[PDB]
Write a protein that binds this DNA or RNA. Structure first.
Lengths: 144, 60, 260, 132, 178
RNA sequence: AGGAUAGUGGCCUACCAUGGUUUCAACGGGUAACGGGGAAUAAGGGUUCGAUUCCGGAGAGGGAGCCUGAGAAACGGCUACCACAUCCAAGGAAGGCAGCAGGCGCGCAAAUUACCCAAUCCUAAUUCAGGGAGGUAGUGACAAUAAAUAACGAUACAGGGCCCAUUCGGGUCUUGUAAUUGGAAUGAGUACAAUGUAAAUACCUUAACGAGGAACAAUUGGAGGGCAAGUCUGGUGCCAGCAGCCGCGGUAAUUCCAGCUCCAAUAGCGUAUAUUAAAGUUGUUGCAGUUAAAAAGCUCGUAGUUGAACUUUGGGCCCGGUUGGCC
């Protein structure tokens, strides 16, 4: 008889069953328990400013071979240290150390992207200006 | 995960490109006119072998 | 909280004043008076919005501060004076006596009447009590106390008031075969000759009503108001007579009525 | 001014304000579009006020032009106008003078200063140390 | 107090073909205009779907269906031969675009192209009745067809030749007996 | 039973009794929780959101207490303590923007120390005063609506429909290409004016000036598949870099850096996060459970869920409603 109760007065069993079984999809468990606000260096935010501690060359995952030119970044609102990827050939030269950058997610909603291991974020802005603008020479970085 | 990677090689190809400059060309229309242009270029001119057409065919 | 509200916003004001809502701001709050906040019509609304004699509140005030307009034989220079059902408004300009009545859609119909009909008004007795020194009194829907009436005036009857002397000329009982003007409810503005009554002790007495088109319906006795016998009202009724021609009949009219 | 052609729609008499209130409709082809004062003159010429018991306002032009519509009043006396009509319209028509008063926040500052009650004598001499 | 929406699959070449054909036939600058007509048509269709689910000789059906039909007839989308609340579902974007003014200008003559018609409309020429109009998306109500004409202003219908002729008259005709 | 209260009442206590709630989820914890009207997205069912422009609850740095009064446990009102903090001729005094505008911090993340009571309405002994409530403008690509960036000819090339249906006669014409060229239409922008407005700025009107490109110049993303659009050129050579996924790149790269061309949406287009559909991948509608995840070791058993058939059927006679269909 399909397992579930079909009876006209079984709505309690049905809804308590749902309540207990919704804790098997990742999205529901995330929403309810709260993992953005506890874990997740961006506390449920889309972006986050951080101070560049270091530049890094991450060797890609197999079967590819390359060095991906990321940065170690300390966040301002948490103090969490975070690796973040600098796209768009060059732009590791346009960043420098102790620069203020703005980080965004690297696209895949938590989990990492492509051949870059451990990295979950990308750099969007440096010292108030966009890396895209600097790369296309629409603007120039403020030094002073 | 990894410290070692010689960051000097950054910007290599974009620095090494044989910079070509953009050719100044006539102005393309914008909007209603462009749609007129495309309607012509689609339903007037081109087709290909026995059933087909291509919109950016390379020279052969 | 902390005392009573003095303001009233556009969107909170009863729908039968017809002004505008979204951050259109404020509406005229009826002052305390004989009638309730929602079942009333202030003079600012009666004059600026319906008759179009004025365009602004300062114009309405300029009118009211000249003893031109009087409600029930009394001037009422207050801007937000709550005028209500079966209230007589008298302007010596054009000698227009306005009765406030209801159209069938529930708005306040602007009925024009004769001076002889403006001489009086009607009142539904809400309670009948003894006052101090054994003096019986009746209270109407317009907060009018009347001492020493006929002892047959029981509750929910209606009364004819002479409006200059607050005295009773004649009363009409609540019984079957009596006309009714519904005040309040979905069926507001309908006129339908009581069929019968349903008691329900402790439970909101109901009344079954029958329009001239034999369109029976049901209302609450607090919302019922008698006005006369079968086919002999005591007031000039408005254009419509409380029938509620359905939307279909209405479009049939305003398409076949007139090509204008 | 070729066939200016003023018309008056929706005429209401208002004895309790002593006015006739109506809608002005100007059909004004191929000219400089309205001239409110030309309307005042052309309208007093037919409502018998000579200029000044007439007030008129609002006057939007149809898209495309050649026509404008506004609201109009004509009173039974210039006195009735000068008491009923508002002072900004009287100033527009030159039948009054807009008072030269101070700015709003200046008036308010003055009120807040005058909320503090004093003037008697040589204690006048040490107001350099009020707020500093 | 606001409204509009757009399609589902951003590609699908058959749609692109159809949309661009309509755009070229009717003189349009965007796919947003086709999307707009499809949106209107969807509202109409789902309304009529609900009414058809209702009972026949049902008051809401009669009222709202006759109203919808009357509106579409007086616009001229729904022909007066088919007035039964099923061709309302059978309608199409071509049937609306044919009643657009730009199209009506061209089909009534007077412009020798839909693009010229659009230009004339937006250049403070064509008027409807006597009101000048500058919107191609106007939906003539089947009676102003015999009132679409050049304006009392607007050369090709009236007064001063404007700018280019006015200036060339001085560049040329005044420059005769220098 | 009394006291207190505006009044009911363990509200408060005296005496007395020992009850009251709970697997139909009590009590406790959490809430990145004010509640609703409502919003977003959905074939239908639904999931998520709801600090807000209505409604009512609260609160005025935290707590507590109270005067006045019809109404306050009031904070643009007092009293105290705590915490922050201002003036000082150091004795004392005065504070509370989660009202308005500022823009110190916080940060991914949000405007002018502007004009006015002319409208909406409110208060006042009041038609006259006041009102940062409110309206007006400024900043404003939050979102939405409409909608320019060009149209039509003539000559040189590749075609022809129809008028007079009197032979290749004139053509009101037609589909694209030009180091071919013409006169026409304007508006964006300036701006006399009036209009608009409390007064202005804009809108709608409108004299005059305001297109021919080198000019009044539309971007944003992409061109391996998914997924519309390169069997082009140059460079680099598992490097640089692209890539949501699958995958490109190791000396002939349809994926990188550029040029050309082409595509999609277009004054809007991308990216990040969240959420909805897709997702019958939460499954009441509507999943699955031999072997892909999952039948409990087996039986008993309470709550819960679910529970065999049977009791006035059938036949007539009238009344008057809605639809047809002669005419």
């Amino acid at each position: 008889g399909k397992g579930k109760p079909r009876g006209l007065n079984s709505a309690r069993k049905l809804r308590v069953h749902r309540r207990n079984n919704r804790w098997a999809e990742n999205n529901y468990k995330k929403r309810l328990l709260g993992t953005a606000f506890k874990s997740s260096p961006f506390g449920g935010s889309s972006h986050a400013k951080g101070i560049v501690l270091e530049k890094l060359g991450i060797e890609s995952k197999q079967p590819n071979s390359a060095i991906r030119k990321c940065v170690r970044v300390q966040l301002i609102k948490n103090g969490k240290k975070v690796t973040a990827f600098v796209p768009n050939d060059g732009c590791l030269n346009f960043v420098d150390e102790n620069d203020e950058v703005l980080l965004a997610g690297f696209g895949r909603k938590g989990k990492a992207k492509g051949d870059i291991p451990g990295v979950r974020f990308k750099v969007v802005k440096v010292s108030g200006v966009s890396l895209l603008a600097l790369w296309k020479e629409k603007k120039e970085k403020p030094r002073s | 995960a990894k410290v070692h990677g010689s960051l000097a090689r950054a910007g290599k190809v974009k620095s090494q490109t044989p910079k070509v400059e953009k050719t100044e060309k006539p102005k393309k229309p914008k909007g209603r006119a462009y749609k007129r242009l495309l309607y012509t270029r689609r339903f007037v001119n081109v087709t290909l072998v026995n059933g087909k057409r291509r919109m950016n065919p390379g020279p052969s | 909280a902390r005392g009573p509200k003095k303001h009233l916003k556009r969107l909170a004001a009863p729908h039968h004043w017809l002004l505008d809502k979204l951050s259109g701001c404020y509406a005229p709050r009826p002052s305390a008076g004989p009638h309730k906040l929602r079942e009333s019509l202030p003079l600012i609304v009666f004059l600026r919005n319906r008759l179009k004699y004025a365009l602004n509140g300062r114009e309405v005030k300029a009118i009211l501060m000249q003893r031109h307009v009087k409600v029930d034989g009394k001037v009422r220079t207050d801007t937000t004076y709550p005028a209500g059902f079966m209230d007589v408004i008298t302007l010596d300009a054009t000698n227009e006596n306005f009765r406030l009545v209801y159209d069938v859609k529930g708005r306040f119909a602007v009925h024009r009447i004769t001076d002889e009909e403006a001489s009086y008004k009607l009142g539904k007795v809400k309670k009948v009590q003894l006052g101090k020194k054994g003096v019986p009194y009746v209270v109407t829907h317009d907060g009018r106390t009347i001492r020493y009436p006929d002892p047959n005036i029981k509750v929910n009857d209606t009364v004819k008031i002479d409006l200059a002397s607050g005295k009773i000329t004649d009363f009409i009982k609540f019984d079957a075969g009596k006309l009714v003007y519904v005040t309040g409810g979905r069926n507001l503005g309908r006129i339908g000759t009581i069929v019968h009554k349903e008691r329900h002790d402790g439970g909101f007495d109901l009344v079954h009503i029958k329009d001239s088109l034999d369109n029976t319906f049901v209302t609450r006795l607090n919302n019922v108001f008698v006005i006369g016998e079968q086919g002999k009202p005591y007031i000039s009724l408005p254009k419509g007579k409380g029938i509620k021609l359905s939307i279909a009949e209405e479009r049939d009219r305003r398409r076949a009525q007139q090509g204008l | 001014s070729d066939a200016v052609t003023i018309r008056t729609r929706k005429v209401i008499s208002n004895p309790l304000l002593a006015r006739k209130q109506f809608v002005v409709d100007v059909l004004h082809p191929n000219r400089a579009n309205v001239s409110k004062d030309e309307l005042r003159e052309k309208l007093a010429e037919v409502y018998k006020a000579e200029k000044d018991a007439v007030s008129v306002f609002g006057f939007r032009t149809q898209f495309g032009g050649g026509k404008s519509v506004g609201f109009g009043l004509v009173y039974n006396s210039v006195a009735e106008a000068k008491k009923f009509e508002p002072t900004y319209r009287l100033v527009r028509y030159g039948l009054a003078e807009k008072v030269e008063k101070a700015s709003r926040q200046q008036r308010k500052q003055k009120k807040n200063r005058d909320k503090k009650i004093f003037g008697t004598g040589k204690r006048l001499a040490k107001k350099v140390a009020r707020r500093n | 107090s606001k409204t509009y929406s757009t399609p589902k699959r951003p590609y699908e070449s058959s749609r692109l073909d159809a949309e661009l054909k309509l755009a070229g036939e009717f003189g349009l600058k965007n796919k947003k205009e086709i999307y707009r007509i499809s949106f209107q048509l969807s509202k109409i269709r789902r309304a009529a779907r609900d009414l058809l689910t209702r009972d026949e000789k049902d008051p809401k059906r009669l009222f709202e269906g006759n109203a919808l039909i009357r509106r579409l007839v007086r616009v001229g989308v729904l022909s007066e031969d088919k007035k039964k609340l099923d061709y309302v579902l059978a309608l199409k974007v071509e049937d609306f675009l044919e009643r657009r003014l730009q199209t009506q200008v061209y089909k009534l003559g007077l412009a020798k192209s839909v693009h010229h018609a659009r230009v004339l409309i937006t250049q403070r020429h064509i008027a409807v009745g006597k009101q000048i109009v500058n919107i191609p998306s106007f939906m003539v109500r089947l009676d102003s067809e015999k009132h679409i004409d050049f304006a009392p202003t607007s050369p090709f219908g009236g007064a001063r030749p404007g700018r280019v002729a006015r200036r060339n008259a001085a560049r040329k005709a005044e420059a005769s007996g220098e």
